[PDB]
Design an enzyme around this catalytic site. Structure first.
Site, PDB file in Angstrom:
ATOM      1  N   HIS A  69       0.808  -1.238   0.000  1.00 33.57           N
ATOM      2  CA  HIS A  69       0.000   0.000   0.000  1.00 33.57           C
ATOM      3  C   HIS A  69       0.835   1.279   0.000  1.00 33.57           C
ATOM      4  O   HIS A  69       0.322   2.356  -0.332  1.00 33.57           O
ATOM      5  CB  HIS A  69      -1.081   0.020   1.113  1.00 33.57           C
ATOM      6  N   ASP A 123      -5.988  -3.125  -3.597  1.00 36.83           N
ATOM      7  CA  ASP A 123      -6.219  -1.699  -3.224  1.00 36.83           C
ATOM      8  C   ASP A 123      -7.305  -1.434  -2.163  1.00 36.83           C
ATOM      9  O   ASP A 123      -7.235  -0.459  -1.334  1.00 36.83           O
ATOM     10  CB  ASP A 123      -6.839  -1.037  -4.525  1.00 36.83           C
ATOM     11  N   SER A 129       3.231   1.999   8.583  1.00 36.95           N
ATOM     12  CA  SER A 129       2.927   1.111   7.445  1.00 36.95           C
ATOM     13  C   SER A 129       4.232   0.488   6.900  1.00 36.95           C
ATOM     14  O   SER A 129       5.218   1.221   6.627  1.00 36.95           O
ATOM     15  CB  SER A 129       2.358   1.934   6.282  1.00 36.95           C
ATOM     16  N   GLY A 130       4.230  -0.815   6.633  1.00 33.07           N
ATOM     17  CA  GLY A 130       5.345  -1.438   5.925  1.00 33.07           C
ATOM     18  C   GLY A 130       6.421  -1.979   6.847  1.00 33.07           C
ATOM     19  O   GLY A 130       7.198  -2.810   6.455  1.00 33.07           O
TER      20      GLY A 130
HETATM   21  N1  LIG Z   1      -2.719  -0.253  13.543  1.00 32.81           N
HETATM   22  C1  LIG Z   1      -3.292   0.808  13.039  1.00 32.81           C
HETATM   23  N2  LIG Z   1      -4.133   1.496  13.806  1.00 32.81           N
HETATM   24  C2  LIG Z   1      -2.878   1.329  11.680  1.00 32.81           C
HETATM   25  C3  LIG Z   1      -1.890   0.720  10.925  1.00 32.81           C
HETATM   26  C4  LIG Z   1      -1.495   1.267   9.707  1.00 32.81           C
HETATM   27  C5  LIG Z   1      -2.126   2.435   9.257  1.00 32.81           C
HETATM   28  O1  LIG Z   1      -1.758   2.985   8.049  1.00 32.81           O
HETATM   29  C6  LIG Z   1      -2.633   3.153   7.033  1.00 32.81           C
HETATM   30  C7  LIG Z   1      -2.117   3.832   5.976  1.00 32.81           C
HETATM   31  C8  LIG Z   1      -2.889   4.106   4.871  1.00 32.81           C
HETATM   32  O2  LIG Z   1      -2.123   4.799   3.943  1.00 32.81           O
HETATM   33  C9  LIG Z   1      -2.235   4.805   2.612  1.00 32.81           C
HETATM   34  C10 LIG Z   1      -1.763   5.962   1.985  1.00 32.81           C
HETATM   35  C11 LIG Z   1      -1.855   6.061   0.598  1.00 32.81           C
HETATM   36  C12 LIG Z   1      -2.401   4.990  -0.153  1.00 32.81           C
HETATM   37  C13 LIG Z   1      -2.509   5.139  -1.666  1.00 32.81           C
HETATM   38  N3  LIG Z   1      -1.482   5.547  -2.441  1.00 32.81           N
HETATM   39  N4  LIG Z   1      -3.689   4.903  -2.238  1.00 32.81           N
HETATM   40  C14 LIG Z   1      -2.862   3.821   0.502  1.00 32.81           C
HETATM   41  C15 LIG Z   1      -2.791   3.731   1.902  1.00 32.81           C
HETATM   42  C16 LIG Z   1      -4.248   3.730   4.826  1.00 32.81           C
HETATM   43  C17 LIG Z   1      -4.794   3.044   5.924  1.00 32.81           C
HETATM   44  C18 LIG Z   1      -6.228   2.544   5.975  1.00 32.81           C
HETATM   45  O3  LIG Z   1      -7.031   3.028   6.744  1.00 32.81           O
HETATM   46  N5  LIG Z   1      -6.510   1.518   5.165  1.00 32.81           N
HETATM   47  C19 LIG Z   1      -7.770   0.848   4.959  1.00 32.81           C
HETATM   48  C20 LIG Z   1      -7.431  -0.479   4.306  1.00 32.81           C
HETATM   49  C21 LIG Z   1      -8.670  -1.313   3.954  1.00 32.81           C
HETATM   50  C22 LIG Z   1      -9.338  -1.617   5.278  1.00 32.81           C
HETATM   51  N6  LIG Z   1     -10.386  -2.642   5.156  1.00 32.81           N
HETATM   52  C23 LIG Z   1      -9.842  -0.277   5.835  1.00 32.81           C
HETATM   53  C24 LIG Z   1      -8.673   0.664   6.201  1.00 32.81           C
HETATM   54  C25 LIG Z   1      -3.981   2.785   7.043  1.00 32.81           C
HETATM   55  C26 LIG Z   1      -3.105   3.064  10.002  1.00 32.81           C
HETATM   56  C27 LIG Z   1      -3.474   2.528  11.229  1.00 32.81           C
END
Ligand SMILES: N=C(N)c1ccc(Oc2cc(Oc3ccc(C(=N)N)cc3)cc(C(=O)N[C@H]3CC[C@H](N)CC3)c2)cc1
Lengths: 241, 4
Positions: free
Chosen positions: A42, A91, A191-192
């Site tokens: 991601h 995605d 993340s990652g």
């Molecule tokens: N432990 C935690 N609390 C935690 C851990 C990691 C976190 O990091 C991120 C980072 C994130 O960042 C992104 C930036 C950017 C691009 C892109 N280029 N489209 C994708 C993702 C999105 C999300 C996010 O909300 N994703 C969804 C995925 C599908 C799911 N079913 C619903 C949520 C979370 C945040 C919290």
């Protein structure tokens, strides 16, 4: 990391910081071999203002402690020559959220730079087990990245509990790790990065990759991580490691 | 691998 503490210097020598050109720290990753890192698919998605999928847009910092001291003794800077997003990465659901990053030149192993062990495919990190999450991400939801690498102690949650807390969102590639009461969790910017698990002779194995969560450290909203053992063979097939 |  929410709810954590400053790491000691060199305490997680496999934790890596990924910076996109002109933007600073964006994601974590883990060192697995002289030539390879593991991270989350991601982190590497293009958007309309920036080709996050293009390896040449990134710098990896190995042996890094403090984001304001990226040129400290021991810190190694590396470019990427390849990003391999899992072919089944979705995605929308974040299924198969894993990526392999090929360093442009190998890391030098040192007291500050060292690979994490990888678990074999049949290994299972059991429910209840304490494990460690680390990163430079937000220390509160909506809140500021940490300058100093943070660590936090979290526990693997039962898969059924996990699925039920996050209905229609948890696949068998995912694992909930944290606490139903909240308090300690990863967050944006983590993340990652790896989960580090202390195994039977005290060596640390990678138990997961920071993937997503609803907010950070909320009650009944544990962090969700990509499992590692499921991908041992994919890592081998793609990297030789 | 896996120690400091
Ligand atoms: N432990 C935690 N609390 C935690 C851990 C990691 C976190 O990091 C991120 C980072 C994130 O960042 C992104 C930036 C950017 C691009 C892109 N280029 N489209 C994708 C993702 C999105 C999300 C996010 O909300 N994703 C969804 C995925 C599908 C799911 N079913 C619903 C949520 C979370 C945040 C919290």
């Amino acid at each position: 990391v929410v709810g954590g503490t400053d790491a000691d210097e060199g305490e997680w020598p496999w934790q890596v910081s990924l910076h996109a050109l002109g933007q600073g720290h964006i994601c974590g990753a883990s060192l697995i071999s002289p030539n390879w890192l593991v991270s989350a698919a991601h982190c590497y998605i293009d958007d309309r203002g920036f080709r996050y999928s293009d390896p040449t847009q990134w710098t990896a910092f190995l042996g890094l402690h403090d984001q304001s001291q990226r040129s400290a003794p021991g810190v190694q800077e590396r470019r990427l020559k390849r990003i391999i997003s899992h072919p089944f990465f979705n995605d929308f659901t974040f299924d198969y959220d894993i990526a392999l990053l090929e360093l442009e030149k190998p890391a030098e192993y040192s007291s500050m730079v060292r690979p994490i062990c990888l678990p074999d495919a049949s290994h299972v990190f059991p429910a209840g087990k304490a494990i460690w999450v680390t990163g430079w991400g937000h220390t509160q939801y909506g809140g500021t990245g940490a300058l100093i690498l943070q660590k936090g102690e979290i526990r693997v949650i039962n898969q059924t509990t996990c699925e039920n807390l996050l209905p229609q969102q948890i696949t068998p590639r995912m694992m909930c790790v944290g606490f139903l009461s909240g308090g300690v969790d990863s967050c944006q910017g983590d993340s990652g990065g790896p989960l580090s698990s202390v195994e039977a002779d005290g060596r640390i194995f990678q138990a997961g990759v920071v993937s997503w969560g609803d907010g950070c450290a909320q009650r009944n909203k544990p962090g969700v991580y990509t499992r590692l053992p499921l991908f041992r063979d994919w890592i081998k097939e793609n990297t030789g490691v | 691998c896996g120690l400091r």
